[PDB]
Structures are given as C-alpha cells and as structure tokens.
Amino acid sequence: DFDIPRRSPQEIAKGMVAIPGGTFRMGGEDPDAFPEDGEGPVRTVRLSPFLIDRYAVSNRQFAAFVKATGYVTDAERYGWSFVFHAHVAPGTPVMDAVVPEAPWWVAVPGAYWKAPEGPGSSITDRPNHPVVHVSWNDAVAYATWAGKRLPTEAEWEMAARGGLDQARYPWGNELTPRGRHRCNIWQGTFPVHDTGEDGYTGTAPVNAFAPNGYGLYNVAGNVWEWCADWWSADWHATESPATRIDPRGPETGTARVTKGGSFLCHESYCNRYRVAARTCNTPDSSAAHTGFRCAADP
C-alpha cells in the first residue's frame, strides 16, 4: 500500500556486513535430526555476494517503518497472535484454541508487535529487542520498504555459519565454550520452567552475546528468522545447478522457511538451535518468538 522510497547503497548497507561470493557446505548430518526437517544432505553451495544485517530487525526499526507507512501487520488484521503460555499475564483474555501437539502456545487477542504479550503490555523497555509477531508478509514489507529483501535459506546459513566449515553452532561445536553462554535459548525443563541461566526468559536485545566470525549477532536462538524460501524437506536433495548455485528453494509451497531457533528451543525437545536446523511457518502466521533480519544485493 506504500510507495518504495529512494535509498542510497550506503544507507541500505548501514548495519549490514558484506558476505563475499564463495562456496560453503550447507546442511547437517546430526544423527538425531528429525528426518522430516530435511536438514540433510550436506552439500556444497556457491553463492553470489550479498549483504546481511548484523542484527535482527528491532522494535525501534519496525516502529519507524510503521510510522512512515501506516502498515497494518497480519496480527492486527487478524486480531490475535501466539504468546508463550508463561508470558500471558493473568486476567488477559485468551482464545480456547489449541495448537495441536503444542499446548504451551496461546492465541491471545490483541497480541501484536507493539503489545507482545497482549492488551496491556508494551515495548517501551524493549526498543533494541527483535520485533516479533511479524509474519513473513510483514517482514517482506519492511524489507522492501527498506530497500532490502529476506535472505534465502542458503544466504542465511552461510552468514550464520560465520566462516566455519560445518560447525554445530555459529561459534563452534561447544554449546557453552569455556562454560559461557553464547545464545539465548531455553535452560531447564521445557515447557514447564526456564531457568534463565543464559540471562533471558524472553527475547534479548539484538546485540546480545558475542557475534560470529562474520559479525552477526544472535543467529542462534533469541527469535526464529523468516527466510525467502518456500519450505520443503527434499527439494534440496536433488543435485543440480538450481539446488547448488544461488539456490532459491522450491518454486512453490505452503509454508516459508524459518531459521536459527529461539529462546524456547532446548535439546530435550526440538534441538533446533543448531545452525543446520530448520523449520517453517505459514506466511501470515506470527508468534512471540519469531522475527527476521534482512539481506540486500550490493
């Protein structure tokens, strides 16, 4: 509904790192991987050079987009969004809706990006947190307004891997090297109690913890990140140029790829904060643990 504003390369590039063109080994061979996630095979992928944000898009940055355009997010058009059960303050009205197999997810009317736990919450103390309750549609809109685009899954994974060849995490193979926490995921007993041992039992600021070798922050944990690709478990098992040179994912689908894991992920349940991990969500869905960062062409 809004015209695309004129932006300079250096304005688009602010807050982004230049990933140089090259190959990298994409995917995972973890024996415990859920086969339905299609984390394999591991393959070599060549990519044209691209820019990617150091940070997930923040609340402050999303509010600017909303203020400049008047964009209405899918969660506002719908009237509700998904809030984790422990974060719904008592008294808040909730739908009786049950996400099958995930009763910890609550449909809260009036939960959206500026009120992430429902009516009566605010983001005044979370300006540098990742924006959440943004659908894939909302993300594309921001990106296009900003002169950017969502990363492909391969761009996302190349950048999140930080110049490491087939490490488990963005920083290496140890979850907590030297016993220090490196991302915001779950600790304790999911979904009953998060001990917050890494410092956060919700979103953390987008600059939390140390960056990976390419300078990216919180590619592991904090919030799931929308990518451009249609989801599939097996399109990328074919060996062809379409799947190994600047791959765009399948031409069609019903859900869009999400990468990186979030503050709810934990080894005992999903184990999806590994950098090869992947899942999806339908493109107008939104939840309290899902955001995005942008990519751009140089």
Added chain:
Amino acid sequence: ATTPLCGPSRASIL
C-alpha cells in the same frame, strides 16, 4: 512422539 513443533501456524488451530 512425532516431530517437535516450533513454528505455530494460524492454520494449525482451525
């Protein structure tokens, strides 16, 4: 017992 679910979709509740 099946596959863990991290992406909750609007369609899943219908």
